Design a protein around this ligand. Structure first.
Ligand SMILES: C[C@H](CS)C(=O)N1CCC[C@@H]1C(=O)O
Ligand code: NA
Ligand SMILES: [Zn+2]
Ligand SMILES: [Zn+2]
Ligand SMILES: [Zn+2]
Length: 219
């Protein structure tokens, strides 16, 4: 199942679901429809959902995916690099993410960049920004200036998150500064999209900071 909702103009938020030990988690990402084709950020959470996802893209827009950008090495972000490459899309990731994928023997992106990069596709513009370590050492966010949408990915927890989620590769002591960096640089954001679960509640950044503090206080 893939849920797709228009967020602003040609920018859409898509959500897929993956159940872990009785807890049904949602993974949120976005895709942009341009005159040159569709740009997909991250990927459906689960390989058995890739075809269903692009099938929905065709049903709704009758267009082709020409680019895929992974915001970190995990399955819900970089899991589709092989698939999107196979169907003709130009794939990207940061060099740090590439190093992690290589180490884990996971498919890698065709092109890599040094943490930050500004993109221009058709008449659309967006930028990938590295705020520092948090959920992982390589996590990046994507900013769409025209739509005023900040795709936070997993460094941003949903306002209803019970805990920080998977922290086996996290840097909790650096996470607060990284989130403060995002907040300061994209202060005028109309929409901030958390990587998991409910993203609509815009207190997501506040709750994230709350969860980090809670974790640290408990030592
Ligand atoms: C929970 C994260 C996504 S934030 C996840 O999918 N992981 C963490 C380690 C195993 C799996 C993966 O990406 O390989
Ligand atoms: Na590899
Ligand atoms: Zn992750
Ligand atoms: Zn995630
Ligand atoms: Zn809170």
């Amino acid at each position: 199942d893939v849920k797709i909702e228009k967020l602003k103009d040609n920018l859409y938020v898509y959500t897929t679901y993956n159940t872990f030990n009785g807890t049904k988690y949602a993974a949120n990402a976005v895709y942009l429809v341009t005159d040159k084709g569709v740009v997909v950020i991250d990927c459906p959470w689960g390989e058995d959902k890739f075809k269903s996802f692009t099938d929905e893209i065709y049903k709704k827009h009758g267009k082709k995916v020409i680019m895929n950008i992974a915001t970190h090495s995990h399955d819900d972000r970089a899991g589709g690099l092989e698939y999107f490459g196979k169907i003709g899309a130009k794939t990207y990731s940061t060099k740090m993410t590439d190093s992690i994928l290589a180490k884990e023997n996971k498919p890698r992106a065709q092109y890599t960049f040094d943490n930050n990069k500004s993109f221009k596709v058709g008449k659309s513009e967006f930028q990938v920004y590295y705020p520092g370590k948090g959920h992982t050492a390589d996590n990046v966010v994507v900013w769409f200036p025209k739509e005023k949408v900040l795709v936070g990915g997993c460094i941003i927890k949903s306002a209803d998150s019970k805990d920080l989620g998977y922290i086996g590769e996290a840097y909790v002591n650096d996470w607060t500064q990284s989130v403060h960096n995002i907040q300061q640089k994209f202060s005028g954001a109309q929409y901030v999209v958390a990587g998991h679960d409910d993203w609509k509640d815009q207190r997501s950044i506040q709750h994230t900071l709350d969860l980090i503090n809670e974790y640290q206080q408990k030592q």
